[PDB]
């Protein structure tokens with residue numbers, strides 16, 4: 001039921017299996033890996049120690065046999081990462097993309113919603 005993560009920048013997270021489609025709409029890991037390259041300057045810059053985990057959690061979200069939904073990031077981590085990384089996008093004339101809008105993620109790991117919050121699987 002769950003597929004291993006083929007994306008190289010996503011291979012050290014604490015989980016290693018996923019299920020497409022991801023939280024951005026890709027059916028294929030390979031398309032997600034291509035789109036991920038857009039962010040490598042940001043990752044290289046080091047605006048947030050959580051950026052890689054956050055992007056991987058969105059582009060290649062955690063799958064488990066016990067759960068029928070992709071498990072993505074919590075809104076809290078998204079807001080934290082946005083706070084640190086959006087300034088870098090903006091100084092270069094870009095913006096925090098709509099597809100990473102922090103509203104589309106659950107606010108906290110509830111018993112009413114599941115999401116990840118740190119580099120914790």
Ligand SMILES: *[C@@H]1O[C@H](CO)[C@@H](O[C@@H]2O[C@H](CO)[C@@H](O)[C@H](O)[C@H]2NC(C)=O)[C@H](O)[C@H]1NC(C)=O
Nearest residue numbers: 082086095096097098099100101102103104105
């Ligand atoms: C981010 O996502 C949120 C949640 O969908 C958006 O909030 C809605 O935005 C639309 C478009 O203007 C409004 O019609 C709704 O009334 C908004 N809902 C709420 C609760 O604010 C938001 O527009 C998106 N963009 C940003 C930058 O936050």
Ligand SMILES: *[C@@H]1O[C@H](CO)[C@@H](O)[C@H](O)[C@H]1NC(C)=O
Nearest residue numbers: 004005013014015016017121
């Ligand atoms: C995936 O990662 C976990 C983390 O400890 C490891 O125990 C498991 O053997 C790994 N499996 C694969 C297929 O990478």
